Write a protein that binds this ligand. Structure first.
Ligand SMILES: Fc1c(F)c(F)c(I)c(F)c1F
Ligand SMILES: [Cl-]
Length: 162
């Protein structure tokens, strides 16, 4: 198990434009296109991302390319943030994957609300951090996925993805 396999499980793979859990146009392995309700706007973002006129359908290779870019971007986003970097750096490789997962799902400023959780994670107060992470819109809206990610933070194992 690794970050790619983990996010592949949590996000799935769809080669046609679909709406994500929040109702937003998405493609591939959870590649958010736009928050606009316009399918045409979404198709435009897709074409821009792929570099060709797609009309809402991509290949597996194209999906995986976007996925690689997105995972890369998530990690880079963490390290660029002078406040988030220390927490990330304090973690083992398994928990780092859990951090990337959350960033991927909500954006580093979607994680702005997780300040208190982050503090407990840096303190390695795993059970306390786990309890705190669940007190969130995130957990309530996507409980199955949140439970998996939280278990990964609690244990530092891949048990939730077995
Ligand atoms: F740097 C970090 C992040 F940006 C983050 F979102 C989470 I959840 C983390 F646990 C973390 F360490
Ligand atoms: Cl599930």
């Amino acid at each position: 198990m690794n970050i790619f396999e983990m996010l592949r499980i949590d996000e799935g793979l769809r080669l046609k434009i679909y709406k994500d859990t929040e109702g937003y146009y998405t493609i591939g392995i959870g590649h958010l296109l736009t928050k606009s309700p316009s399918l045409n706007a979404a198709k435009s973002e897709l074409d821009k991302a792929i570099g060709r006129n797609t009309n809402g359908v991509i290949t597996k290779d194209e999906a995986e390319k976007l996925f690689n870019q997105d995972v890369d971007a998530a990690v880079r986003g963490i390290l660029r943030n002078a406040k988030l970097k220390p927490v990330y750096d304090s973690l083992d490789a398994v928990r780092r994957a859990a951090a990337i997962n959350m960033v991927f799902q909500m954006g580093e400023t979607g994680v702005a609300g997780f300040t208190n959780s982050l503090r407990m994670l840096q303190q390695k107060r795993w059970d306390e951090a786990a309890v705190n992470l669940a007190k969130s819109r995130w957990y309530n809206q996507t409980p199955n996925r949140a439970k998996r990610v939280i278990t990964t933070f609690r244990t530092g194992t891949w048990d939730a993805y077995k």
